[PDB]
Design a protein around this ligand. Structure first.
Ligand SMILES: Cc1cc2nc3c(=O)[nH]c(=O)nc-3n(C[C@H](O)[C@H](O)[C@H](O)COP(=O)(O)O)c2cc1C
Ligand SMILES: CCCCCCCCCCCCCCCCCC
Ligand SMILES: O=[N+]([O-])c1cc([N+](=O)[O-])c(O)c([N+](=O)[O-])c1
Length: 354
């Protein structure tokens, strides 16, 4: 069991060959972490360059969620990858990571119903269905979420196009690849769950239909940059801006074998504590995916180096993403390697970019 941790995490430092294109120097990923520190043009800053560069001992960094176009924005100062200036800013980031001997994927984002018009000139918020989430944008003054417009099939075609274009830009920006943000209640995840997807056309109703948008985005991006440079984060368990539905599991039962056919660089779980068991999944999120998907899997969520090592030793998943400890400890990898004390994460640390 994972709690029976041992006195060595050597396996975390195994070389891991993702595919013919990419080999990782270790199994430790920096999880994607929104920091809200990009400039007014949503361009990565030189402070962001330094922040990523100092974490290049990670086998692979997954960037903070990066928006594909303006109506994807739901939080302040989140970087994009749709303008030339943004591409240039990211190129500074990737160049610095590579110069430090690291690798980095961008996480491509559209927030769907979690966008807010304050950020993009009062335009329409888009989602599979006109189902508003509760509340307001965190850490902002009174920005109440709004009822989305249910996307038309023409909207959907444009969105697929824009995911694909962003992927092309990612290559110009010198990233090693893309992690498609299909998790945590955002646009792609919205198509995959019944709470948000009440459609009755070819994008709703059945597992095949509800999976259609995800697969169209994945296929369009592969067509642009190749399967070896394409990963996907998913959240089979509803927990963030998403109500649960007992019918969601069969959507993922369909999706996962379909994803296997695309021979992705990895599938990555989106969750905060993977020790949590989901009734509807019959156990933990990672164990559910591991039972329905037989290629590289990134685990995440409240793992220590020790419990991650044990999980990987027990074949529960292949790579470990580390989030909050990488905020608290820029030198996470070195400290783990040398058995040094790690600082515990505190939410207060988000005020600083170090
Ligand atoms: C401040 C913060 C920002 C996050 N931003 C993202 C993000 O941009 N994209 C994403 O998929 N997950 C995001 N997450 C979730 C993390 O990637 C990760 O799944 C979560 O922090 C659990 O892992 P951990 O226990 O090692 O921190 C974020 C989490 C935190 C705490
Ligand atoms: C500033 C960092 C993020 C702050 C908000 C946390 C978002 C994730 C919340 C974790 C899970 C809560 C609800 C889960 C419901 C279903 C669980 C079985
Ligand atoms: O504030 N945020 O923009 C934000 C974004 C993401 N995300 O996944 O893209 C999160 O998972 C969280 N989160 O749950 O902490 C926050």
């Amino acid at each position: 069991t994972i709690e029976n941790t041992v006195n060595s995490v050597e396996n975390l430092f195994d070389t891991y060959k993702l595919n013919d294109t990419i080999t990782l120097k270790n199994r430790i990923l920096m999880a994607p972490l929104t920091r809200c520190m990009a400039d007014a043009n949503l361009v990565p800053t030189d402070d962001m360059v330094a922040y990523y560069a100092r974490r290049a001992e990670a086998g692979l960094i997954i960037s903070e969620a990066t928006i594909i176009r303006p109506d994807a924005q739901g939080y302040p100062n989140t970087p994009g990858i749709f303008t030339q200036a943004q591409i240039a800013g990211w190129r500074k980031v990737t160049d610095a990571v590579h110069a430090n001997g690291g690798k980095i994927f961008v996480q491509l984002w559209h927030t769907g119903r979690v966008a807010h018009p304050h950020f993009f000139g009062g335009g329409d918020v888009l989602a599979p269905s006109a189902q508003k989430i509760e509340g307001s944008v965190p850490r902002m003054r009174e920005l109440t979420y709004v009822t989305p417009k249910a996307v038309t099939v023409e909207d959907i075609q444009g969105l697929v196009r824009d995911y694909a274009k962003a992927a092309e830009n990612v290559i110009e920006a010198g990233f090693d690849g893309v992690e498609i943000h299909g998790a945590n209640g955002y646009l792609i995840d919205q198509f995959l769950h019944h709470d948000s997807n009440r459609r009755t056309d070819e994008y709703g109703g059945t597992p095949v239909n509800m999976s259609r948008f995800a697969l169209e985005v994945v296929d369009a991006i592969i067509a642009r940059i190749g399967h070896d440079r394409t990963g996907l984060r998913i959240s089979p368990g509803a927990y963030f801006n998403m109500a649960s539905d007992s019918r969601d599991r069969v959507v993922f039962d369909y999706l996962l074998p379909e994803l296997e056919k695309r021979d992705l660089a990895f599938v990555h779980i989106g969750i905060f504590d993977d020790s949590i068991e989901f009734d509807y999944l019959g156990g933990t999120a990672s164990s559910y995916v591991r039972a329905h998907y037989g290629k590289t899997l990134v685990g995440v969520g409240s793992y220590s180096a020790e419990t991650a090592s044990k999980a990987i030793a027990e074949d529960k998943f292949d790579l470990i993403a580390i989030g909050r400890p990488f905020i608290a400890n820029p030198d996470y990898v070195a400290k783990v390697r040398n058995s040094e004390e790690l600082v515990a994460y505190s939410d207060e640390m988000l005020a600083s970019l170090i």
